[PDB]
Design a protein around this ligand. Sequence first.
Ligand SMILES: C[n+]1cn([C@@H]2O[C@H](COP(=O)(O)OP(=O)(O)O)[C@@H](O)[C@H]2O)c2nc(N)[nH]c(=O)c21
Ligand SMILES: Nc1ncnc2c1ncn2[C@@H]1O[C@H](CSCC[C@H](N)C(=O)O)[C@@H](O)[C@H]1O
Length: 467
Amino acid sequence: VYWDLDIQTNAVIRERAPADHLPPHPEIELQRAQLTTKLRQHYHELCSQREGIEPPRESFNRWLLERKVVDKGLDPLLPSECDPVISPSMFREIMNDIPIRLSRIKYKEEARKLLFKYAEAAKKMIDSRNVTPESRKVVKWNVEDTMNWLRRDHSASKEDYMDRLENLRKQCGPHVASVAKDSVEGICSKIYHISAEYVRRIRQAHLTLLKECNISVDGEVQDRLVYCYPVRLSIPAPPQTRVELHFENDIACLRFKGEMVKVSRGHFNKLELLYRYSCIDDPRFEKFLSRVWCLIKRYQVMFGSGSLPVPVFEALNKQFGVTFECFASPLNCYFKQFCSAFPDIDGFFGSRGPFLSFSPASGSFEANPPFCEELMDAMVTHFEDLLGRSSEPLSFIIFVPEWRDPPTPALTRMEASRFRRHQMTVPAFEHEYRSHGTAVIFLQNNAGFAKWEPTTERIQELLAAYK
Ligand SMILES: C[n+]1cn([C@@H]2O[C@H](COP(=O)(O)OP(=O)(O)O)[C@@H](O)[C@H]2O)c2nc(N)[nH]c(=O)c21
Ligand SMILES: Nc1ncnc2c1ncn2[C@@H]1O[C@H](CSCC[C@H](N)C(=O)O)[C@@H](O)[C@H]1O
């Protein structure tokens, strides 16, 4: 099986006012998709025109995640009100690819060609851009030195070329960085400001749509602890629109005005159950296909086009009482209760909203965050705040990459946390099909430690499931 939606929550929260998100509609989701495509195209053009490189692979997606750590703006996907304006994530990634991206190397000839390509690009940079005399002579020295060695008869393995390249990059990098720093900062700021303008246009289109539906957007003390429940929207949803569904080779194909999105039949059936469990404004499923269309399109837009193995979730539930994923989507969730990036659309399918906004007083949780350093670091701060704030049983079992060279602040801080009860590293070789190692950290307050202690037997059962 791929999920266990029968497991009830043990997450406990203060009851919530309904959220103010504008209710989703395919016409708006399509516009957001089109503008996000244009934004990616602007990013490509800025990287090419200003630095002669392709956008670092997956950097835009990580930018979306880092921006949402600080974004106070009105769009569920795109950023528009962020301090600082310049993303440290996008800045870091672009700078690492200047003057060229270091590709993956398999052959010694490709290692030799990359060494040459770096030296040549560094020289082109020094000859054509504003650079201090000191930085110019250092880069020039190192480049001509590499060129003279390459032009000679030499002896090197691919490892020797790569180390030669690493040493040349070591010598040139600080100087190349100082040359490009202001230009790269300008790419980061410009793409943010274009995004904010797109957010404004999407917002105006969405408000106009609601007004056309005669739906008002202008619409109490919360003093009880309740078991968690999906995010509810205060604004009435607009009427369903025409979305056509048919199946092709066990793929659900959903068409809105000629725009097709696809999801596997298994995921479609899962979404139908999640909706039955999570949606309270649509008893005859009239809005269901509209919302599935928005959901699929939203997640396709987010990424541009893995989860723990099921036996691990089973063992987390049986051995440590886990009922809830801090990082998930309706498509990948194992439990019917989870946090996700997009409560405006995911709440209908069980989302409790984004994790940094989620405030559990109690519960046993799993957390497998996106590979985003800034989100991971904010996650840890949030863990420590929650664990210190409540005396009810609270446990987080956290899976992050073994980033050691260099370390990432989230892992370093979790290893120094006063709430750490156990830690281990797990290599994994069995990966599920869908038709080095992982650091596992147990953070628990005293009550959670008493209730879900990482004893030897429980850890052994968890490791037995983690192949
Ligand atoms: C391997 N690695 C990747 N990252 C983060 O992931 C981003 C993308 O790194 P990448 O090398 O472009 O791709 P990869 O993650 O698939 O290897 C980086 O800019 C970092 O934010 C890493 N961050 C830290 N601190 N340490 C690491 O060893 C490390
Ligand atoms: N702010 C946020 N809050 C909660 N989840 C988020 C988030 N930002 C991104 N995510 C989601 O985090 C998930 C990480 S993949 C996690 C897979 C699976 N639920 C597991 O626990 O193993 C993705 O679905 C991603 O969309």
